[PDB]
Design a protein around this ligand. Structure first.
Ligand SMILES: *[C@@H]1O[C@H](CO)[C@@H](O[C@@H]2O[C@H](CO)[C@@H](O[C@@H]3O[C@H](CO)[C@@H](O)[C@H](O[C@H]4O[C@H](CO)[C@@H](O)[C@H](O)[C@@H]4O)[C@@H]3O)[C@H](O)[C@H]2NC(C)=O)[C@H](O)[C@H]1NC(C)=O
Ligand SMILES: *[C@@H]1O[C@H](CO)[C@@H](O[C@@H]2O[C@H](CO)[C@@H](O[C@@H]3O[C@H](CO)[C@@H](O)[C@H](O)[C@@H]3O)[C@H](O)[C@H]2NC(C)=O)[C@H](O)[C@H]1NC(C)=O
Ligand SMILES: *[C@@H]1O[C@H](CO)[C@@H](O[C@@H]2O[C@H](CO)[C@@H](O)[C@H](O)[C@H]2NC(C)=O)[C@H](O)[C@H]1NC(C)=O
Ligand SMILES: *[C@@H]1O[C@H](CO)[C@@H](O)[C@H](O)[C@H]1NC(C)=O
Ligand SMILES: *[C@@H]1O[C@H](CO)[C@@H](O)[C@H](O)[C@H]1NC(C)=O
Lengths: 53, 132, 53, 43
């Protein structure tokens, strides 16, 4: 709802809520990995070669 | 098509008006103050911080003379050194924001004065009902 | 009280696995000595006199 | 210089250990106090 006869100074640069949002997104990013699977047995010697082309 | 009086009566709608006309609504502000795996912790401390604030303000009114009246009076006169403004101009000229930034230095004096004045009122009322 | 180990001590990192680490006592440079502690004689005597009092 | 009657309190222990990679094993040594190893059972 609108507000009238009103002067308010804003700032995006000294603004908060980008800080805790940058916290929260990486936090939920890590919450999306604890069910998932590690690859600790996979780091091993690799016999690699060029693809058929 | 919705009407302008409704958003006048909305939450924080009267922030720009004069304080005399902003007196006609406080209940919406008061009502929207109260309530309306890891994350619920943050949710929960936010909710209890809000009710801690609400109880602090209710206690500050409770130690004062008025509990649920929401519009009060007292028995300490206004020091003209605080404001020296005309009585006509304050209700029809200024907003609450600039009123707050004017009187914002004169704080915690008036609080203790209200405490003292109604403590004296309590002992006077106790004395009057003790003699009777 | 003074307390010391006088031996000069080198650590050594050992990678256990992928992104793992381990620290271990590598070489010891200097005199192979023995750790110890010291207290003042007469202070200890006087404080024991106080507690016996 | 070892005393035959007193005892030193530091032991040089070499052993197999894993690496970054699974198929590679390595030989590494360190030192330990007498009070954290025991003898299992000549060599
Ligand atoms: C990535 O590299 C791997 C390396 O192992 C590779 O897998 C191997 O590829 C070769 C060639 O594609 C496969 O050999 C074929 O195997 C099938 C199944 O047994 C046979 O039918 C094939 O025979 C045909 O070709 C012959 C050639 O002379 C003809 O004589 C015959 O008549 C058939 O037409 C051929 O032998 C091999 O089996 C795989 N091995 C495994 C384990 O899959 C893979 O293809 C590479 N992938 C990419 C994307 O580069
Ligand atoms: C570290 O790991 C290696 C690898 O397992 C160990 O080496 C192996 O030790 C065994 C027994 O000590 C050896 O068997 C013996 O080998 C000798 C020499 O050929 C032979 O005469 C004996 O009859 C018996 O077969 C084995 O060969 C040896 N393998 C390798 C690759 O070294 C080692 O003991 C571990 N510890 C240290 C401190 O290195
Ligand atoms: C313990 O031994 C190490 C051996 O490296 C000493 O470190 C050296 O000290 C000298 C002089 O202080 C320096 O010139 C070298 O550059 C140092 N080397 C390293 C790798 O740091 C260390 O000073 C000794 N500590 C004591 C208390 O004697
Ligand atoms: C394999 O890769 C190397 C380097 O990318 C390339 O020179 C070579 O032609 C490739 N193919 C074979 C069959 O070696
Ligand atoms: C409020 O008080 C401070 C010092 O107490 C003073 O510097 C400031 O000018 C005052 N503000 C107003 C609006 O009087």
């Amino acid at each position: 709802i609108h507000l009238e006869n009103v002067t308010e100074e804003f700032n995006m640069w000294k603004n908060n809520m980008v800080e805790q949002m940058h916290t929260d997104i990486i936090s939920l990013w890590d919450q999306s990995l604890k069910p998932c699977v590690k690859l600790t047995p996979l780091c091993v010697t690799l016999q690699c070669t060029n693809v058929t082309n | 098509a919705v009407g302008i009086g409704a958003v006048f009566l909305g939450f924080l709608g009267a922030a720009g008006s004069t304080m005399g006309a902003a007196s006609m609504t406080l209940t919406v502000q008061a009502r929207n103050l109260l309530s309306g795996t890891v994350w619920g912790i943050k949710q929960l401390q936010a909710r209890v911080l809000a009710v801690e604030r609400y109880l602090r303000d209710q206690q500050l009114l409770g130690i004062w003379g008025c509990s649920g009246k929401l519009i009060c009076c007292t028995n300490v006169p206004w020091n003209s050194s605080w404001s020296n403004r005309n009585l006509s101009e304050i209700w029809d000229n200024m907003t609450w924001l600039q009123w707050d930034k004017e009187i914002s230095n004169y704080t915690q004096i008036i609080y203790g004065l209200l405490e003292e004045s109604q403590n004296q009122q309590e002992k006077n009322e106790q004395d009057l009902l003790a003699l009777d | 009280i003074n307390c010391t180990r006088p031996n000069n001590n080198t650590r050594k990192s050992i990678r256990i696995g992928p992104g793992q680490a381990f620290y271990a006592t590598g070489d010891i440079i200097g005199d192979i000595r023995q750790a110890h502690c010291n207290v003042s004689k007469a202070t200890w005597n006087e404080t024991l006199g106080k507690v016996v009092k | 210089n070892i005393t035959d009657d007193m005892r030193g309190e530091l032991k040089n222990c070499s052993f197999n250990m894993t690496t970054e990679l699974r198929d590679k094993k390595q030989k590494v040594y360190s030192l330990f106090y007498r009070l954290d190893v025991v003898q299992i059972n000549s060599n």
